[PDB]
Amino acid sequence: KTHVQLSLPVLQVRDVLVRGFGDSVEEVLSEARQHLKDGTCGLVEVEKGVLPQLEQPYVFIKRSDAAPHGHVMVELVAELEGIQYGRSGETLGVLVPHVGEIPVAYRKVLLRK
């Protein structure tokens, strides 16, 4: 399927144990996609002071369309030293590995895979 319905656990930035997916734009997009497939991917909502507490490169989910079955259609955009790889809509949050942190909420997304 070109899209997969996912429910992403929303994590508080200060709880996050593994603060990024790796060391290159290509690696973080790769790793983010693998963790999304394996159900081991969390979401941190972006506000003032969040991104400097996480590791670059960043992987964002961005709204790709204006929402089947409650699931917002999203795609992945990476960012490194202020350059983005991908072009999409509004940021829903920054993806991180999920290693058992307790979430505050779930974000239903339809991921372009």
Side-chain angles (χ1 to χ4, degrees), residues 1-112:
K1 278 176 192 311
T2 68
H3 285 78
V4 60
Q5 278 180 354
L6 301 172
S7 278
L8 299 182
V10 177
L11 310 179
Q12 307 196 315
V13 67
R14 289 186 187 277
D15 286 343
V16 173
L17 296 180
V18 183
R19 288 180 178 267
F21 282 115
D23 298 331
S24 71
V25 164
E26 290 163 275
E27 184 178 19
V28 300
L29 284 169
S30 185
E31 283 292 329
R33 289 190 166 98
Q34 192 65 56
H35 282 81
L36 287 161
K37 175 234 166 110
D38 298 343
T40 58
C41 191
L43 182 63
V44 181
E45 293 188 323
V46 177
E47 282 177 356
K48 289 304 191 295
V50 165
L51 286 176
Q53 294 186 69
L54 299 173
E55 291 173 341
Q56 295 194 50
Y58 308 131
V59 177
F60 300 109
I61 47 153
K62 283 178 167 298
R63 190 196 214 92
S64 63
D65 190 5
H69 315 268
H71 294 254
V72 172
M73 294 191 46
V74 299
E75 59 202 335
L76 302 192
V77 172
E79 179 185 306
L80 178 54
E81 293 151 4
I83 300 167
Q84 294 196 336
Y85 302 81
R87 161 177 218 269
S88 190
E90 193 197 351
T91 294
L92 277 75
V94 51
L95 300 180
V96 296
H98 190 211
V99 295
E101 301 96 330
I102 307 304
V104 293
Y106 288 91
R107 197 71 211 249
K108 293 185 288 174
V109 307
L110 197 41
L111 165 69
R112 189 175 298 172

